[PDB]
Design an enzyme around this catalytic site. Structure first.
Site, short mmCIF file in Angstrom:
data_model
loop_
_atom_site.label_atom_id
_atom_site.label_comp_id
_atom_site.label_asym_id
_atom_site.label_seq_id
_atom_site.Cartn_x
_atom_site.Cartn_y
_atom_site.Cartn_z
N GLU A 481 0.82 -1.22 0.00
CA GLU A 481 0.00 0.00 0.00
C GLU A 481 0.86 1.27 0.00
OE1 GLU A 481 -2.49 -1.32 3.39
OE2 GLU A 481 -4.22 -1.32 2.02
N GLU A 550 -4.42 -10.33 0.67
CA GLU A 550 -5.21 -10.19 1.89
C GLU A 550 -6.69 -10.44 1.57
OE1 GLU A 550 -4.50 -6.32 3.66
OE2 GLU A 550 -2.37 -6.41 3.11
#
Ligand SMILES: [Mn+3]
Lengths: 1024, 258
Positions: A481, A550
């Site tokens: 991220e 994820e």
């Protein structure tokens, strides 16, 4: 900015004088631990810290001590501050590249002894396994160097600086720097020397600096392989190198914590079962390529390793230095659009594992890491993602030996750049297919910022070069991220130059312009499917596959619908599995003041407990395991949905399908649970299946022998035939007994031999029901039928908001009429209650009819609930009765799902059977919420001391139930805040809302939602 | 509310008082008009609803008051008033620009300026005034994160929207991060000049102020020049407030203001 030192605000000052990264090998003869008590002092900012060029040991001696390794926010009595939890948001102002001026600075100091012979015999280095955030290093009052990269290692040449006698090491550690901007992982902010410190003594005239080991199959049939060993030798005084490869030890090898962690030794003979030997010649390249005949493959399912010994040899033919390590024969490729290991398109059954310990934080004892991995193996996990940084270097041999597919990930997260943007634009949601356009807006700050290229490359170089030789690692990840920019492209080029043997992952790069793999986090099935279809051409070919780095956010009660994700994984070759977030809750142990008690209790902290200015609350608690790293119902469910063998029982047949990637079913014993005798199951290859005729209801797949870290008899997979709902053979007493019916102004009594029934007509409340020494009564607050549940973490963002908005917690029963008639067909009496069940403020509600048909030993309760009125809720949490249990109550027993809790979209791991409450440790959530429900319940027996049982069953459908003690669950911050009544209650439910994963991911799926509708259900209260 | 609805308008400008009757029915006869600057009453003609009059006057402040007890109101009760707008006048304070010997101590963290009757200490790390004592009178900065603050306890009106914004942008968590501090000897009558360069920005956020605080120290006066440059992306629409917070010395007893 002269009030902030230059090196803490220079993105290019990645280090000063750090040695080049090399492959990590622990050697007891070379490594000397400097762990233990160090002199330590904390200062408000750099300018208050002493000049280390003038710091005596005589001065530092007088300071308090701290123990290395440890975080300074995790000391006795919070001496040096408390942990800070932020998820996305930076805990500092964003002024790239400046850190805050007030910047906690910790000065460490200790001494070590050096011999006359030592300085002559050895090259001396200091190796730091991890320091957060960055540090400058001094020896004997002389500056050695500087280092950034908290989860990376660092070695410094110390030879110039050392003296005979006492030597002084001083480390200046800083909490913040320009580096902070790229270290914004969703975790605790913790500082200090949190990993090992060592003094290295390498042989002086010549030593082994680096080793590269690769195994490439020569052939498309993956038989013969080329073993390539390249050595970097430093110095002149050596002759050649020797190399011995030993006979393989099969991956079924038995390990425990002791043998996995054994670090010995100098005089210890590594192995003697020689297989191949090679010698180099004087003045020739210290490298070679060997052809190896059909070696045993290394696989995560079978981590077969060949031990090897590499020897550096002098002129006199003596051994200067030895490396004892292992080779795993494995090749990873991108092949026909799939991640391929030894030609096989693998499936990830994975988790993200952070470094976390409930007391030590990121300073995790290896013992504890071993504990983690044994547990993972015990629960069918085959892969781990190092979210979001490399771990302690010793951990990777653990992966190698136990067998995990590993994603080793760069220490680089930039998430916080988005937070001001999210708030300014009032962004509600991000979706895997479109969110990249949002991150693109701010990429210029860091990931597309040329000033940070050196730092970004350093994170890559450090990642790869330390861990290159571990067969378990198949994918390098560029971080997490951090948006997408030129720096990522640069990292990709470098990693492919450094290590062509592995694949590169980076989720922030949606289109994988500089990655070999596609990756989503928390995607919807529709989103997965859109992507699949848009990347599969008309021929059915795809260029790259999809993993879920994820998914199935494990926060609290949940995750729901792991099942539906798995079905998708098995159906399409394009999907290769996922890694659930996360392995364990990040709870820190602390003393909590109880809301229930007024007293002090041990609890596990999340955001807010340490009184941060800014924090992200309970998002700390998002693991399959709790803060103490023990399994939750989440882990229990995951183990079942990912089981590598399918057992289906239908129509007098057991179908067994092997769902492993590589291994056979030979290691498994199949037991017919109905008889106890074993079933002869043919050896099944991956994807092969067999149908065996059988009358069995329940088949278990179990380990034949101790293998790896698993014990003989350990359950790998199981199956059951579906169980029809059978009405118990309870005999209702329909004989004519004289019964006194007293229909008063407010209360109605029905009395007979062994029976007492009192109802408050004003409330619709059962005042007392006592049959044959067994008593219940309604647990009444506003209504006899209730709908609320203490919201789960998943309920919070949306469903709870709706349920609160529609006042479902304030549902009221308003009685309209009560009808009392004498018994008919064996009946003693019939009491019928007409009411409206509706919340205050609102029109919507249920026109309700409750018909109580009273027999001598049984009470039939028919409930009819007609949904009426405008402005209705979409769904309810729950629907059913609440009953106080009599003082006699001692335990319960049920036929249905168990032994643990179960919910509509989280139930399949809980097989059918007869369960006793006495055999079950009911699960305590770190964050109090909806728990303890049992779904698909056939019947429930409640045992009363000295009076036998009350049997409860719903007509024609299985039901839901919870028996507990507890209340104040909604507002209890921690387990110790939960209040307890002086008696138990039964929550008896017709239906319950699913659980989902909406705290981060998809809402409860449609088929599991408790949609607003009419309710009609019949219960029997049968008294023994 | 009493002021905005006053049933008589009194406007004072250009040496004129204009009085307009804003009643629906009654006259101004019941009212006594006093020139507050002199105390002597003003002869105002009987005004009907909506009638007005301009009277030449040097007055600054005129009051309309009840002549006699009437209804439940007492003689002298104020019904309406007007004031001429008041120009901002600099007080006639004499700054001591005479040359006094002054000790300047620019330490590693703290900067001291000492002179006869003067003591100025600044924490360079924080931008905080540790102590300012001049002629027996002491103040210091009330400091939590910043020497310039922006928050106010939200009003009832603030709650539904403005507060939501101010909280969302962490205005309550505004921080001062010092970049450089400059210490020079006094020039034009000055004892010393201490200039502080910093960024004032909240945690989590890009937006903030590139700030310059120039403290020009005289023997009996301290000139504080503040320059705040709004910088960065994703800014709030507005702030509750902007200014300094100072602790007052133990000596403090009361205040007075124009
Ligand atoms: Mn608590």
């Amino acid at each position: 900015s002269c009030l902030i030192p230059e090196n803490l605000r220079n993105p290019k000052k990645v280090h000063e004088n750090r040695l080049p990264t090399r492959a990590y090998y622990y050697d007891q003869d070379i490594f000397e631990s400097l762990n233990g008590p160090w002199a330590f002092a904390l200062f408000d900012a750099p300018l208050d810290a002493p000049d280390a060029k003038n710091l005596d040991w005589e001065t530092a001696k007088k300071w308090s001590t701290i123990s290395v390794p440890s975080h300074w926010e995790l000391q006795e009595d919070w001496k040096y501050g408390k942990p800070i939890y932020t998820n996305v948001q930076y805990p500092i102002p964003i002024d790239i590249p400046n850190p805050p001026t007030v910047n906690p600075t910790g000065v460490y100091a200790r001494t070590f002894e050096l011999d006359s012979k030592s300085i002559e015999s050895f090259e001396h280095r200091l190796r730091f396994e991890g320091v957060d955030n960055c540090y400058e290093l001094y020896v004997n009052g002389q500056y050695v160097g500087f280092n950034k990269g908290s989860r990376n290692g660092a070695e410094f040449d110390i030879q110039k600086y050392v003296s005979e006698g006492e030597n002084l090491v001083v480390v200046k550690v800083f909490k913040w720097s320009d580096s902070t901007y790229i270290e914004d992982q969703d975790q605790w902010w913790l500082s200090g020397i949190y990993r090992d410190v060592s003094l290295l003594k390498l042989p002086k005239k010549a030593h082994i600096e680096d080793v590269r080991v690769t195994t490439t199959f020569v052939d498309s049939q993956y038989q013969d392989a080329e073993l390539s060993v390249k050595v970097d030798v430093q110095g002149s005084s050596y002759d050649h190198i020797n190399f011995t490869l030993y006979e393989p030890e099969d991956g079924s090898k038995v390990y425990d914590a002791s043998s996995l962690l054994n670090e010995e030794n100098g005089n210890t003979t590594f192995s003697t079962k020689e297989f191949i030997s090679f010698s180099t010649k004087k003045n020739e390249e210290t490298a070679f390529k060997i052809n190896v005949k059909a070696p045993e493959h290394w696989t995560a399912e079978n981590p077969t390793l060949y031990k090897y010994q590499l020897d550096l040899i002098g002129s006199d033919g003596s051994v200067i230095q030895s490396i004892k390590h292992h080779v795993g024969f494995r090749q990873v490729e991108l092949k026909d659009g799939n991640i391929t290991v030894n030609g096989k398109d693998i499936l990830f059954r994975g988790v993200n594992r952070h470094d976390h310990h409930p007391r030590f934080g990121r300073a995790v004892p290896l013992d504890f890491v071993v504990r983690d991995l044994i547990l993972m193996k015990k629960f069918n996990i085959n892969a781990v993602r190092n979210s979001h940084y490399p771990n302690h270097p010793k951990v990777y041999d653990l992966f190698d030996k136990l067998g995990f597919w590993v994603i080793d990930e760069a220490d680089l997260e930039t998430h916080g750049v988005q937070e001001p943007f999210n708030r300014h634009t009032n962004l509600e949601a991000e979706y895997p297919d479109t969110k990249n356009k949002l991150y693109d807006v701010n990429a210029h700050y860091l990931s597309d910022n040329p000033e940070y290229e050196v730092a970004y490359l350093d994170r890559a170089s450090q990642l790869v070069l330390r861990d290159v030789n571990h067969p378990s690692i198949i994918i390098w990840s560029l971080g997490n991220e951090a948006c997408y920019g030129r720096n990522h492209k640069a990292m990709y080029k470098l990693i492919k130059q450094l290590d062509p043997t592995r694949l590169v992952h980076y989720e922030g790069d949606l289109n994988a312009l500089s990655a070999d793999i596609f990756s989503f986090m928390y995607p919807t099935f529709e989103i997965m499917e859109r992507w699949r279809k848009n990347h599969t051409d008309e021929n059915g070919k795809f260029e790259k596959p999809l993993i879920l780095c994820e998914y199935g956010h494990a926060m609290g009660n949940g995750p729901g619908s792991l099942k539906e994700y798995q079905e998708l994984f098995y159906k399409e070759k394009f999907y290769q599995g996922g890694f659930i977030w996360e392995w364990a809750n990040h709870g820190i142990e602390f003393e909590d003041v109880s809301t229930a008690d007024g007293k002090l209790h041990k609890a596990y902290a999340y955001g807010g407990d340490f009184k941060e200015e800014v924090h992200d609350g309970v998002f700390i608690m998002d693991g399959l395991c709790n803060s103490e790293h023990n399994p939750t119902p989440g882990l229990v469910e995951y183990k079942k949905v990912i089981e590598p063998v399918h057992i289906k029982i239908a129509h007098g047949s057991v179908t067994i399908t092997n769902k492993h990637d590589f291994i056979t079913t030979d290691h498994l014993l199949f037991i017919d649970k109905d008889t106890g005798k074993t079933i002869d199951v043919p050896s099944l290859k991956p994807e092969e299946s067999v149908t065996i005729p059988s009358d069995t209801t329940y088949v278990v797949a179990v380990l034949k022998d101790d293998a790896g870290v698993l014990k003989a008899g350990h359950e790998i997979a199981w199956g059951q035939a579906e169980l029809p709902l059978k009405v118990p053979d309870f005999v209702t007493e329909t004989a004519e007994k004289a019964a006194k019916i007293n229909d008063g102004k407010r209360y109605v009594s029905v009395e007979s031999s062994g029976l007492h029934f009192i109802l408050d007509k004003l409330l619709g409340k059962i005042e007392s029901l006592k049959v044959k020494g067994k008593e219940i009564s309604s647990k009444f607050e506003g209504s006899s039928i209730t709908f609320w549940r203490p919201p789960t973490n998943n309920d919070e963002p949306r469903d709870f908001k709706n349920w609160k908005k529609y006042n479902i917690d304030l549902m009221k029963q308003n009685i309209h009429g009560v009808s009392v008639e004498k018994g008919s067909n064996g009946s003693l009496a019939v009491v019928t209650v007409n009411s409206r069940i509706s919340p205050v403020v609102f029109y919507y509600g249920f026109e309700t009819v409750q018909k109580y048909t009273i027999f001598a030993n049984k009470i039939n309760l028919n409930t009819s609930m007609k949904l009426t009125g405008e402005y209705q809720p979409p769904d309810f949490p729950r629907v059913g009765y609440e009953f106080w249990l009599g003082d006699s109550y001692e335990s319960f027993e049920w036929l249905g799902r168990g032994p643990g809790e179960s919910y509509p979209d989280k139930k399949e791991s809980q097989r059918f059977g007869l369960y006793d409450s006495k055999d079950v440790e009911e699960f305590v959530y770190d964050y109090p919420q909806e728990n303890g429900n049992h779904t698909d319940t056939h019947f429930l027996n409640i045992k009363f001391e000295g009076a036998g049982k009350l049997s409860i069953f719903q007509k024609e459908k299985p039901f839901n139930f919870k028996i507990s003690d507890e209340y104040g669950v909604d507002e209890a911050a921690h387990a110790c805040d939960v209040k307890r009544y002086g008696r138990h209650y039964l929550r008896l439910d017709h239906a319950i809302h699913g659980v989902g994963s909406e705290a981060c991911g998809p809402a409860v799926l449609d088929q599991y939602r408790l949609k607003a509708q009419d309710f009609n259900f019949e219960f029997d209260l049968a008294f023994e």
